[PDB]
A paper describes a structure:
In this paper, we report the deposition of the XFEL data for the recently published SFX structure determination of a rhodopsin-arrestin complex (Data Citation 1) as well as further details of crystallization, data collection, structure solution and validation. This rhodopsin-arrestin crystal structure is the first GPCR-arrestin complex structure that reveals the mechanism of GPCR recruitment of arrestin for desensitizing G protein signaling and initiating the arrestin-mediated signaling cascade.
In recent years, reports have been increasingly emerging about the successful structural determination by X-ray crystallography, owing to the development and the application of new techniques including protein fusion and the lipidic cubic phase (LCP) crystallization by which protein crystallogenesis occurs in a membrane-mimicking mesophase environment. SFX has a high potential for structure determination of challenging proteins such as GPCRs and other membrane proteins that often don’t form crystals of sufficient size for synchrotron data collection.
Residue numbers in the entry:
A (entry chain C): -159 to -149, -104 to 326, 1012 to 1339, 1343 to 1361
B (entry chain A): -159 to 326, 1012 to 1339, 1343 to 1361
């Protein structure tokens, strides 16, 4: 428009303030035009475009200068464009400023904004430089040294060289190391591996081609090569982007919800990598096939997406909006929500148990990484989005080649520093690459350590949990005086919640949560215990002189030993709670536990099992009635069981009694022993699943009653090869039974974390109504536990 | 002689007494002291006797005091010049008569007799007696003097004969007064008081009223009920017949005579009464001997239950009758005699009067020694070894409470059996022995009645202990006295309350672990309310008839028993099998599972084959799973309700193991008494484990280097039946046998292979053949070879079975034939299905 016209032509206050000073001159000049008797009729006759051209003349020369033009203003008023321009071209004004005048003179002839060219447009390219001097040539043919200094092309060659030397080894090593080591290949790392592949496409497809062209100073490969280079450069950047989005989603869902660790197998990881490739191709492909275009950007060396030149033939407006809104804002919102809720959950969880120092070290290291993840994301993509936005809002202004290079610097730098933060700073990949870079290197019972210095003793594995008080751990530890000299032996009780692989979760960001941990001294003691047990006395007399006792107690707010059943195809997936008694020697004071000298330590797992109590609860008898949308008649149902507490391998007779007073017919009566798997770690998440189920084919008629008793036998054998089934904690890969019903102590202070279990008989009536089938159902709770031996 | 003379005349007083003179005198006229003090008499008495007598001395001590007087008086006679030549002139008998005179009157009194002592020295007996009879001495004590005066005349002890002898009888009373008459003619009221004859009538009446019904009912009840008629009860029936002979033959006749007071029937009737009385008593005695022998052999050895048919029981009753007639008949035909005993009412054997015409000495010795010692030795040995066996057996498995109640009941009965036997026959034996040792002494009629009381009482109380206290006969007589009154499969009870379910009957026995019993039991809530249902595993050894064995003493032995509860259970079952889960889903809500396991020390299910004629004979091991309802707590297993209980038998069968043992190859050499050359024999089989119905090639190889010729070569598949219950008792038997007619020459070798086919069909109609346990009277096969686990703690009771190939060489030696033989073991079992 008029403001953009004079800004290009004519050339401390702000730019917006200068625009207002200009608008005052526009207002003042237009008044001056309408005042002069010679200028007013010409202004009224001419169109908005030629009016702005007249204002340009009135701006510089003034009303005085423009008023002197008799013949031209006559010919302009009479719609004679050529001879007006001829008279103008032969004047002092064209001689004074032939750059400015030639553009205005052509405007008077054409009557269109064709003359007003910022840069030099082309069929397959856009050079951000004026061809008024007559120096602009094709980027696909001749050198581009007129844009910027020749040494800056050597700088681009040196820069792209730096990206290849840093970029290729890091990403190639990431994949190479993964092929060697089995430890790394896990579904969560699949998305991190996709990030490595994405960055490799930026190196081979993008930077090496940009290097070759930067040396010559122009794009040698032509339009075809520019399309393919720009395609791989975009694809590499977009796959890298959406890889980080998927990684954020994964890390939020997998960490916060422990059940999802089982869920996320290889097929889900493939879907994440697939989605990454689909979203990348969704925005990378259209530039080739019409919607937008790949052209040489900046110095006309690197090819990229056209987000500056508004070409409605290829439709850049809608593409830049589509790109900006979706590919910028949505990842930002998703990633900030993901890691934001992640840190929110961890900070609240860390504050919940401040006694555990290990969680505080984790929470700190996570929050430090999340701040760096955000900084890396913003530094990468904000330059492109901000410049593209500023170019879109201010379209009339001109923009140089080096200005477009600044976003390209930070974005292509992300090809380097994203592997640093997401792969190199990752704890596992750091230790795995350390190995590769350095060429491969860098009755009563007991258990003996590996070094055979410390030897732990325990009376039993299965420790009982009574509702009021828990049965404590009791035992002794034999020590070698010669080996353990000037050292501290500690006996430790450990309760742990385990989810996922040990190497994969600990290394990524934060590790498995410990529900309760307890350290205790042994050799030498300050003296702890009041009086010793019969077990400790017997062991002291049996064993030699270097034997020392210990007594580790459980508090009242812990869960039982419970694991979850994996499928047979799930080879590398495990989640479950388990207790661990461990003893070790060390030089260091009390707080040095999390990290361990491996050789001296010895560990032996135990269980906090709950037997069924002597008092059986009240005989379960649920009852519920129903109505329907048309028929208002009642349908009374009453369920009743034999016992409140059933035992393992016991028949469960469900005496259902249904009295039908409604018009509808019932199709069938199905009973199901459904187990509620209530999983608790960070948040309360219930998970229902059926275990055993039996259904009768009998039908209840209108105004007819029925009394049937169906027996159900919930067993592990029939429920084998199923995901999510909670079992009692196994000792060492041996056969077990279905998980016991967890009992919680009445009116306790702290919340009970861990895997809680409860069973219930759920009868459901398939009622044959008016195509649609109404399924009414009711539940009644019961317990499945072991008997008292 | 002399001691018996003065004991009858002067009278033997044990305690200190004042004589006619009023001096302290003890024993047979043995003075103590002249002082009025009693302790002075005690002083000389205590010093003479040699202990604290306190006036009381034994009869034998009084005899020694008398012998001192005999010695002292004889010295006094020899001191006197008038008495010495008379003492020297007379014989031992008349010397004792003189000592009698010297005892009472003293040396002073006898010294005065001038004329008599002259005539006695001159061998003039009659006028001496006339002179002695005309003295103060005959006037003083004509009872005593008349006996001594007659002794001087005769020179025999006829005056001093205790009782009154006769042709057909012996009365234990003196005929010196002149009151004794024949027991076959006149009353005997002079012997004892008339009311004691009425007592005998009342006593014999009591024996008839108690004796006849008990023994007659025993036989009457047996004729009615089929259950009782069994070989073991045959000897108990013989006891009833024996006691009936004592009633009809003995007591009724004794009753008739006791009322009159003398034996009315004469010598002929006395012989017949005494014959039946002895016969009834002796058949009763030897019946108890046979009963003791039977009960020892039958109980301790389970195999003998089969053996004891009617013919062996008849031999026992026959032997009883033969031994009875062996001692009952001779009194009739000369050796001893039947005469009226005691009060001369009851007739019995003469064991008191020594009559060498009928030879009572040899008879009383023959009877006493044989009929007392042989039952005593046999019966005490029988019941002694029986209780010894049962007490040791009860201690072997104290876990079984049922055996402890039996062992207690047994020991209680055996003590009573001994007490009843001793109380019966000891009185007769002790009195007869005492009479034989002391023949010179007198014995009254009531003294002889005391043994007769206890022996005839045994006619009553033996039926009480042996028949009435017997468990079967007690329940059988109760009926008569009260007039006639007083794929998976399952089995339902009689009342149809409890219903047991089991997957299979044949449970397998592997050597290491036994396959356990698995199943469920359906229960009715309405019928079984406030009751306790138990499922029970029972392993049992059975021998003999079911009713008879409980009655004798103790019942069949259970090898192993284990009961288990069901409704309601302590909790539930830990983990269920596919069978229990399937049955629970098929059946309704009131179904409860059970799992009964076998230990490693039990045998297999094995029975023994009976003969076709053996209709009522059975012995064999079998397993029984039983379920029942009851009101009572756990230990009330011993008794069960017949209606609520339901039982289903099973087997602990052993299949042949997958890996066969080493190829059997036995070898043995032989020598002979004359020829010292070796005869090497070597046997070899195809397999260690043969199966049922498989050919058994016995490749015999005989290398003869001896001078003798072999007659033939016989091979035999022998079944060793090792039966163990109380003691280890092996029982060998052949099953299959084949023999070749070929002969091995001197210095010649032979290699032959004979095949043998052991089958049940060929071995039918044979006693003692062990078979695999039948389910329900169906066809089976020969018993499987039993396998025992290595190095177990407890001993394996039950019927163990094993097979071996026994080759025997009939060697034609120097008419006489030597039969050498060797064995090699093998197994006969079923294949793995």
């Amino acid at each position: 428009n008029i403001f953009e016209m004079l800004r290009i032509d004519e050339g401390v206050i702000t730019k917006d303030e200068a625009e207002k000073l200009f608008n005052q001159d526009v207002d003042a000049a237009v008044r001056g035009i309408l005042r002069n008797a010679k200028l007013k009729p010409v202004y009224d006759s001419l169109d908005a475009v030629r009016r702005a051209a007249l204002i340009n003349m009135v701006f510089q020369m003034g009303e005085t200068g423009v008023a002197g033009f008799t013949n031209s203003l006559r010919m302009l008023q009479q719609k004679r464009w050529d001879e007006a321009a001829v008279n103008l071209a032969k004047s002092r004004w064209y001689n004074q400023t032939p750059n400015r005048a030639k553009r205005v003179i052509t405007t008077f002839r054409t009557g269109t904004w064709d003359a007003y060219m910022c840069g030099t447009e082309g069929p397959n390219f856009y050079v951000p430089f004026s061809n008024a001097t007559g120096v602009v040539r094709s980027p696909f043919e001749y050198p581009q040294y007129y844009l910027a200094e020749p040494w800056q092309f050597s700088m681009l060659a040196a820069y792209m060289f730096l990206l290849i030397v840093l970029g290729f080894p890091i990403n190639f090593l990431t994949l190479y190391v993964t092929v060697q080591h089995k430890k790394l290949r896990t579904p969560l790392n699949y998305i991190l591996l996709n990030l490595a592949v994405a960055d490799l496409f930026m190196v081979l497809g993008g930077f090496t081609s940009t290097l070759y062209t930067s040396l010559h100073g122009y794009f040698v490969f032509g339009p075809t090569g520019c399309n393919l280079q720009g395609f791989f450069a975009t694809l590499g950047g977009e796959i890298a982007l959406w890889s980080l989005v998927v990684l954020a989603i994964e890390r939020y869902v997998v960490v916060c919800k422990p059940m999802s660790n089982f869920r996320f197998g290889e097929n889900h990881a493939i879907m994440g990598v697939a989605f990454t490739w689909v979203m990348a191709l969704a925005c990378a492909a259209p530039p080739l096939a019409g919607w937008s275009r790949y052209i040489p950007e900046g110095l006309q060396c690197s090819c990229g997406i056209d987000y500056y030149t508004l070409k409605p033939e290829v439709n850049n407006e809608s593409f830049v909006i589509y790109m900006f809104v979706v590919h910028f804002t949505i990842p930002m919102i998703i990633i900030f929500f993901c890691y934001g809720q992640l840190v929110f959950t961890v900070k609240e969880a860390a504050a919940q148990q401040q006694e555990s120092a290990t969680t505080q070290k984790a929470e700190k290291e996570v929050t430090r990484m999340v701040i760096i993840y955000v900084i890396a994301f913003l530094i990468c993509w904000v330059p492109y989005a901000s410049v593209a936005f500023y170019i879109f809002t201010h379209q009339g202004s001109c923009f140089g080649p080096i200005f477009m290079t600044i976003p390209a610097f930070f974005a292509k730098s992300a090809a380097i520093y994203n592997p640093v933060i997401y792969i190199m700073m990752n704890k596992q990949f750091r230790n795995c690459m350390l190995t590769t870079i350095c060429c491969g290197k860098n009755v009563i019972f007991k258990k003996v350590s590996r070094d055979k210095s410390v030897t732990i003793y325990l009376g039993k594995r299965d420790y009982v949990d009574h509702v009021s008080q828990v049965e404590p751990v009791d035992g002794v530890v034999l020590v070698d005086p010669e080996l353990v000299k000037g050292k501290k032996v500690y006996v430790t009780l450990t309760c742990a919640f385990r989810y996922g692989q040990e190497d994969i979760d600990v290394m990524g960001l934060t590790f498995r949560r410990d529900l309760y941990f307890s350290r205790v001294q042994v050799y030498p003691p300050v003296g702890a215990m009041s009086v010793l047990t019969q077990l400790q006395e017997s062991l002291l007399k049996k064993l030699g002189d270097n034997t020392y006792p210990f007594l580790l107690t459980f508090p009242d707010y812990l869960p039982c030993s419970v694991m979850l059943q994996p499928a047979p195809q799930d080879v590398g997936k495990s989640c479950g709670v388990d207790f661990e008694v461990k003893a070790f020697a060390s030089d260091i004071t009390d707080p040095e536990e999390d990290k361990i000298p491996k050789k001296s330590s010895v560990r032996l797992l135990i269980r906090k099992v709950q037997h069924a109590p002597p008092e059986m609860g009240p005989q379960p008898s649920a009852e519920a009635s129903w109505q329907f949308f048309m028929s208002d008649k009642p349908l009374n149902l009453s369920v009743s069981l034999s016992k409140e507490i059933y035992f393992h391998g016991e028949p469960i007779p469900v005496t259902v009694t249904v009295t039908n007073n409604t018009d509808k017919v019932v199709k069938k009566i199905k009973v199901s022993v459904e187990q509620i798997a209530n999983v608790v770690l960070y948040s309360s998440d219930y998970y229902v699943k059926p275990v055993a189920s039996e259904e009768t084919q009998e039908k209840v008629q209108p105004n007819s009653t029925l009394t049937k008793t169906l027996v159900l036998v919930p067993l592990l054998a029939n429920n084998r090869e199923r995901r999510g089934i909670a079992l009692d904690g196994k000792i060492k890969h041996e056969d077990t039974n279905l998980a016991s019903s967890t009992i919680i102590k009445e009116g306790i202070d702290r919340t009970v974390m861990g895997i809680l279990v409860s069973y219930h008989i759920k009868v459901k009536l398939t009622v044959s109504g008016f195509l649609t089938s109404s399924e009414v159902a009711t539940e009644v709770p019961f317990r499945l536990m072991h008997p008292q031996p």
